[PDB]
Amino acid sequence: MATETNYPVPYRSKLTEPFEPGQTLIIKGKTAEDSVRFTINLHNTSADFSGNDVPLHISVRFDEGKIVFNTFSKGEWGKEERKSNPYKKGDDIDIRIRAHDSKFSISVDQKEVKEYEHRVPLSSVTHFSVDGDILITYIHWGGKYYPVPYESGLAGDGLAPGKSLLIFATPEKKGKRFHINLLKKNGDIALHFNPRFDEKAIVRNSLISGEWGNEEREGKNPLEKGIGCDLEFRNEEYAFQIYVDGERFATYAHRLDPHDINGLQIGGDVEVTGIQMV
Ligand SMILES: CC(=O)N[C@H]1[C@H](O[C@H]2[C@@H](O)[C@@H](CO)O[C@@H](O[C@H]3[C@H](O)[C@@H](O)[C@H](O)O[C@@H]3CO)[C@@H]2O)O[C@H](CO)[C@@H](O)[C@@H]1O[C@@H]1O[C@H](CO)[C@H](O)[C@H](O)[C@H]1O
Fold first, then answer.
1. Do 244 and 134 belong together in one domain?
2. In this structure, what DSSP letter does residue 123 have?
3. Which residue of 106, 188, 217, 257 pairs with 114 in a disulfide if CB–CB is 3.0 to 4.6 A?
4. Is the sign of the CA dihedral 12, 13, 14, 17 positive or negative?
5. How far, in Å, from the CA of 188 to the mean position of ligand 1?
6. How many angstroms separate the most distant Cα atoms in the chain?
7. Which has the closest alpha carbon to 130: 6, 37, 40?
8. Nearest protein Cα to ligand 1, atom 47
């Protein structure tokens, strides 16, 4: 154990609606120097029964030093498939499971490590559970296949100080660049976030009355082609606090009045797997 707090294990959650292609289940947590193993299961059952089908069973083993995947159905287990466990007892874990129509794609530390073909119906997944030697710190399931170029409005209040836009994406393996625009009602871009792997920098700028501003770079670019990332545009009183994978990558002084940031555009060489306003 460690602390009661959020998601105490054994953790069990009954999905609102079945798990569908395009959706991702994100599980983050902490382990101890004596942690031996923990499991993540996509379960089948009514409400509390359990013990039925397990379309996908994931076992992270610190003793064996492996992450083992399998399926349980019709009262029996199939043949296990293994990958190396990159984690040592202690240090945090970050495992994400994205469903597709023919397989589950599992990433560890945002790096794709396994493609597990469906052995039983994905639609039979009605619950998911986490248990074992792990202290869960974050769980989230959602997203969809976001078409890119992407464009949509932001709530009614939009992105305002005190709020943050969370975007989960993966820069394309052979991508050169992509961008994310936070816009105003008239088309002006309050913030243009533009990673350029060719120039090894992330350009930040504003588009006011059809004109691009100064342009702020400097940072080193913490993004990498083919690796998943968590972008957070934390809107504050005096500036946007741009967080990349949990670390503050940059601050961007507001050039346009905050408030009323009602638009979002995403384009370029990137795959988007999650968008949320928190
Ligand atoms: C407006 C534009 O094209 N911005 C580009 C940026 O272009 C600048 C550079 O090419 C520099 C090199 O010295 O010259 C600048 O123009 C000079 C001009 O040569 C001089 O004759 C004159 O006296 O001064 C001007 C201004 O100093 C160009 O403006 O190049 C960067 C790097 O490739 C581009 O990123 C930038 O395009 C903008 O990038 C943003 C993301 O960082 C957005 O994508 C935005 O939409 C682009 O406009």
1. no
2. G
3. 106
4. negative
5. 18
6. 65
7. 40
8. 212
